[PDB]
Amino acid sequence: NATFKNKEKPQEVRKANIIAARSVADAIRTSLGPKGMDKMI
Amino acid sequence: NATFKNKEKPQEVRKANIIAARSVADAIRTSLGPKGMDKMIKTSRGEIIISNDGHTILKQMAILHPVARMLVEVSAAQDSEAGDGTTSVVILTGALLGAAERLLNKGIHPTIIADSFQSAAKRSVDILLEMCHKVSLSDREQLVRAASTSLSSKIVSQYSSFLAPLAVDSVLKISDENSKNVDLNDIRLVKKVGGTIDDTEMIDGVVLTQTAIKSAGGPTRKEKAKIGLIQFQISPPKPDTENNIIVNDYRQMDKILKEERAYLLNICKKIKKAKCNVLLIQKSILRDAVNDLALHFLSKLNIMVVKDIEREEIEFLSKGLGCKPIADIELFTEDRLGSADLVEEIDSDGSKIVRVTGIRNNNARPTVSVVIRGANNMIIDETERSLHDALCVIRCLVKERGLIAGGGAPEIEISRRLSKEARSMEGVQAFIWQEFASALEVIPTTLAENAGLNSIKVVTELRSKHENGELNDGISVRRSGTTNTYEEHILQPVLVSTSAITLASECVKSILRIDDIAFSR
Amino acid sequence: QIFGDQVTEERAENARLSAFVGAIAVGDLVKSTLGPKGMDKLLQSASSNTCMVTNDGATILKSIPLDNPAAKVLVNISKVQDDEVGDGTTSVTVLSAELLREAEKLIDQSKIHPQTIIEGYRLASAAALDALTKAAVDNSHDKTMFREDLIHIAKTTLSSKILSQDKDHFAELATNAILRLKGSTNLEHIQIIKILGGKLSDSFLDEGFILAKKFGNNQPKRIENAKILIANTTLDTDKVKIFGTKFKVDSTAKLAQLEKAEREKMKNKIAKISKFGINTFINRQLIYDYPEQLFTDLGINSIEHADFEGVERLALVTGGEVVSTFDEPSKCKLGECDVIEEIMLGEQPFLKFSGCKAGEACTIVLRGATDQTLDEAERSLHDALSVLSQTTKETRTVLGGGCAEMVMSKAVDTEAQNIDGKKSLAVEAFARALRQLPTILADNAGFDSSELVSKLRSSIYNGISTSGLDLNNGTIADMRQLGIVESYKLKRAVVSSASEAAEVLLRVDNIIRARPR
Amino acid sequence: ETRTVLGGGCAEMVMSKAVDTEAQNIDGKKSLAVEAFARALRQLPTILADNAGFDSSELVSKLRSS
Amino acid sequence: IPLDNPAAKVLVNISKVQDDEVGDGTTSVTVLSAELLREAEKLIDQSKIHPQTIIEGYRLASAAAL
Amino acid sequence: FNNSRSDTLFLGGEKISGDDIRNQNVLATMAVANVVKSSLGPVGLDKMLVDDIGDFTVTNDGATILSLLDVQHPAG
Amino acid sequence: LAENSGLDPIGTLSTLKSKQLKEKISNIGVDCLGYGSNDMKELFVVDPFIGKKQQILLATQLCRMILKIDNVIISGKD
User: Fold this and answer.
1) Would you call A10 an interface residue with chain C, using a CB distance cutoff of 8 Å?
2) How many of the other CB atoms lie within 10 Å of CB of C136?
3) Are residues B382 and B465 located together in one domain of the fold?
4) Closest among C21, C458, C453 to E46, alpha carbons compared
5) Which chains lie within 8 Å of chain F at 3 or more CB pairs, if any?
6) Same domain, residue pair B359 and B502
7) Cα dist. B505→B17, B74, B442, F67 in Å?
8) What's the fold here for domain C139-215+350-394?
9) In chain F, what is the straight-line distance between the N-terminal and C-terminal CA atoms, in Å?
10) Which residues of E touch B519 (CB under 8 A)?
11) Do C139-215+350-394 and C216-349 fold alike per CATH?
12) Does residue B229 share a domain with residue B343?
């Protein structure tokens, strides 16, 4: 068939930002609840 | 502005082959003319040779560049057709390639460049025919003078008085009329040691390369003879495998002799039934050509025998004599023979060479074999190459009648006329006529450079003198300047300048038509 | 090392890439942000804590430092578009990048001259603006109420102005100076005549193109079935400064003989005037009595000292041309008018034309009591005419949602039908960029653009010229039923700015880097 | 055989406008697939003009419009 | 010319069909077959969808060409 | 010095020309002349001719020295 | 001027030489601005004789001066 060309590659910018932001959420994920893990900075 | 970008560059690859082809013309450029510089070439085998001849340089140059190999084929066709000018035709090709480089810089496609050279070559020949002085083969005084000047460039000079009519009278018999190209391979130059230069015999019928039988029974002469060509060899049976002859008894000796003598006689009997007076046996050093018992058998039957015929002459004798090759005795008959009034062995001094006259055949025509004699080995050699060039100049006059004054005379005037005739054209082609005229001036300019004369000065003297006169002035190394080449006995036939321009337009075409090269096995 | 001090010239191979690919990369920043569904961009500084996220096209282009010298040209084009209207800067840069994207194919695999590519757009953009006019709609509906709303707005513009003395008479003159035009509302179609010795309320509207100067001495004051010719030449004493010349003659009578020979050269030009079959001639300069006397025998009235604006406004009302030379007899664009009548107002002779060919225009004659009443009225009248003309050009919209972009493509493809050899691909490339505008709008919507744009082209090609792209349902529907319209002034501004931006960039065979300030 | 058609690039372009006619009434996603087939048919006179040493963009554009 | 490309070996076998069926104009077949690949590459790279649908576009376009 | 490895003009061997070959011809005949430079005339002196085997010979004749002299050069 | 106007520089130049020779001696130039045909003389496009003569004299005077300098001496920066 014939679809849009997608000459640019914006996905590499979005996928790099989603994976980098997911690592932040996974780090805070261990701190959920009163029994959650404490993080040190 | 903004034009076609040509992202892929097949033309730039061709331009690299043009520069590689022009580099070959630059090396041959120094060898142009009799005063040209020699070139030293060392073969891979270690042989050290030197010469100024462009035909010998390009043959031993061992060019691996495929486009540059075309210059060798043009020099081969230049020597096969005209026989002279193999050096100038290569230089003229490099000028058209150099002029094509400027055309490619203007955005011109090589197809029009190659197509415009076709009309430029056809027009340059037509202009050359207008200035050419028409000569005929019926005049024997013009042919001797044309051949005498070609022999003055060699060590043998004063002895060319008898050599000049030799090449003239040999061609006039084979020329007939309206024969177009006449193959010089029909003229066989026989080189034999001994004698002198003044001793020469034309023998228009034919001449062999070999002696006669030196064993017992050799006739050495025959009258009313029929000459066949036998590729076979008469010998007792000798298989290529391992064989041995062991005689332990008197009965074994007679058994071997009776089988050999009967096998040889049965071949001799079939030869007599065909009325074969003279036999030519192909030379084979592996096995026996003609057994001594066969020599005694063919002597009793009154059959002349000449063996050890060179394999190179087998193809030549089958043509001129009008005979056919015989592979086997079973197919060996009278219909493949010739007709000869007298076959004898004549020895001038020490040569003992066989000559045959009166072929008397309708299919066979006057194929002439000329004998060349001399004391030293360097005599008959240089004489053969000097007379060969004299036959090439005469061959030019037979195929195309007329001659022109050499020394760069036609190259200047044609370049001046094509420059004026370029105004009659229009568009892209009109600019090519101007570049084609400037490319024809490389030959007379190089002649002035290789002779030590001033490049820019001599070329301007030609354009100045050729305005009032017509083909009366050219470059001559004898006077060290611009003079009359017709009074100095410098005569270049028109077919040399015609073939040089024709082969140049075909060579540059085959070059520019190559847009790429790939490995193919 | 040419230039220097941060100034440099790009290579002819790199300059074409910097003017095309380098300009696309700048247009790629605003490419995905075009439309209400467009994406967002990030602007980060060295401190990295000062950053921000915005979709504004004018903010992203101006904030990002551009080292590309060709990118600074698009910055100047963005400033020109921002002066017109504060919206549409993103659409201009994206459309300009699409024209330059196809321009790379208009050079490499095409071999078409770049100025002819611009001339190919000038013929294509002219058909594109004409296609927008045919499909143009308006909210002006209920014009009977709209014609009444204009006279009340004109009264509000007369506040604080000396024209506030009488609102009813002056607002009627400004209202009738616009609606009666039926065409371009520019001030070039309205002539202002400032006179003295009267009252402001005595002014009236006249469409007869009143001009101050008269024509002829003994010539009649009325001309019936007039043929107007427009030309500019000096028929009286050329070389306005003769001081310093040296005339070598044996007597004074021979000096006048050369002037008579100059008068003989006048008949050469006068003969070409009579070959046009005109009873009236227009000239900016003066005319001597001798060539004017020959005009009397030929019956040619000469209006003199018309300046230039007065000449151009005369060519618009009569349908003439401003050419000052004669290239060949009976080949030209001629005007005409039914009756030329000379009147007198304010103790000065005036000329009132009547029955101009296809004339649409008006002349507002302002009669003041002093120069202060005349000058302040003309400046305030043009301000009132500008507000009334703003409602005519704006609020007039066209069908949006990919419709108008595709409708222009059909007209450009019609222009691509009949065309010369070298501009065939140049005009066709302009229609490709017109189809890329709804394509990119469908990109940020998250749908298939190749399916919708292709069906949109085949739908409008045969019938159904009102169809457009529906981004909500992801299909093709009638734009008149959905009520999706976009301003006509915005369409003309983007097309005009794209032609002006491509005019400079396509002529570029090299780029001269600007000096840093 | 010996039944011929009008040559010289004509029939090649005649098929191009015929495929363009097929590109007129066509499905949604099949428009580009059919239109590109006419583009390949128009590249045949482009190659013949390039090998002959002429300008293909000038000839084909005037050949197509005619 | 030896062709290490396995796709080029298939193109040689396709050209053998023109030689066995007719035997004339094989060069024009290979050129036009390559021009269809030039357009098919432009259709794919601008789509990146399975070409089998584009094949149906050529079948409907080739019928109009015949 | 020693022109070699030309990027263009592809051949089965090296090719030199210009002032390079004309300078090598002078340097070649200079070393050959220096061998017979001291042997000229009856006042000349003999020299030693050493082979690859390690033996040698002593003679003042300039004709026998040039015959046994090893020179690899086209002009030499 | 022919390359910047979108015309063949060799084809147009050779065409103008034929119009000024086989037909008659006149002035017909390349087309710089869009028009219907050739013969700028019909367009009354003129150039000053003293202006064109001043160009060829300065071009020759400078071309000779360039040929009169065979050596370039450029000192460094101390």
Assistant:
1) yes
2) 14
3) no
4) C453
5) B
6) no
7) 17, 11, 15, 52
8) GROEL; domain 2 (3.30.260)
9) 19
10) 1-2
11) no
12) yes
Chains contacting C (3+ CB pairs below 8 angstroms)? A, B, D, G
Q: Do the beta carbons of residue C453 and residue C437 sit within 8 Å?
A: no
SS3 state of residue B447: helix
Shared domain for B75 and B150, answered yes or no, is: no
What residues in C contact G34, CB-CB < 8 Å?
A: 119
B214 touches chain C (CB under 8 A): no
Q: Are C149 and C363 in contact (CB under 8 A)?
A: no
- Choice among B84, B149, B200, B389 that is catalytic: B389
Cβ separation of C458 and D31 shorter than 8 Å?
A: yes
Domain boundary residue, one of B365, B388, B414 = B365
Q: Are C452 and C405 in contact (CB under 8 A)?
A: no
Domain range list for chain C: 1-138+395-517, 139-215+350-394, 216-349
Which CA distances in Å does B162 have to B1, B62, B167?
A: 71, 39, 10
CATH code assigned at B29: 1.10.560.10
Q: Greatest CA span in chain B, whole angstroms? A: 106
CA C164 and chain centroid, separation: 33
Nearest neighbour of A3 by CB, restricted to C31, C39, C448: C448
CA distance B152 to B145: 11
- C-beta separation of B338 from B323 below 8 A: yes
Do B316 and B326 lie in a common domain? yes
Q: Which of B378, B56, B24, B321 is nearest to B197 (CA)?
A: B378
Angle CA C254–C258–C260, to nearest 5: 105
CATH superfamily of C216-349: GroEL (3.50.7.10)
Touch of C by A (3+ CB pairs closer than 8 Å): yes
Tokens 């450009």 belong to C412
Residue whose entry in the numeric block shows the structure tokens 């990919």: C402
Q: Exactly one of C90, C175, C363, C397 is catalytic; which is it?
A: C90
Resolution (A): 4.7
Please identify, among B337, B365, B393, the residue that sits at the C-terminal boundary of a domain. B365
Written as six digits, the tokens of A20 are 């980098």
Experimental method used, please? Answer: cryo-EM
Number of independent structural domains in chain B: 3
CA distance D28 to chain C (A): 5
Cα C99 to Cα C70, C436, C490, E6, E49: the distances in Å are 15, 10, 18, 40, 27
Q: Point out the residue among C111, C114, C509 whose CB comes nearest to the CB of B4.
A: C111
In CATH, C1-138+395-517 is 3.40.630.30: no
Instruction: Specify whether B330 is located in the same domain as B235.
Output: yes
Neighbours of chain G (3+ CB pairs under 8 A): B, C
Say whether G6 and C119 touch across the interface (CB within 8 A): no
CB atoms within 10 A of CB C312: 15
CA C365 centroid distance within chain: 26
Distance from CA of B335 to the nearest CA of F (A): 53
C111–B3: do the CB atoms touch at under 8 Å?
yes
Q: Beta strand C467-470 with C475-478: parallel, antiparallel or unpaired?
A: antiparallel
Q: Which two tokens stand for residue C434?
A: 């017109």
- Angle made by CA atoms B140, B143, B149, in degrees to the nearest 5: 140
- Interface check for B67 against chain F (CB to CB < 8 A): the answer is no
Residues 6 or more apart whose Cβ sits within 8 Å of residue B61: B24, B41, B72, F11
Domain extent, residue B290, equals 205-365
C422 shares contact with chain G (CB less than 8 Å): yes
Please classify residue B150 by burial: count the beta carbons closer than 10 Å to its beta carbon, then call 0-12 exposed, 13-18 middle and 19+ buried.
Answer: buried
Does residue B5 belong to the interface with chain C, where contact is any CB pair within 8 Å?
yes
Helix (H, G, I), strand (E, B) or coil at C352: strand
Alpha carbon distance C95, C494 (integer Å)? 8
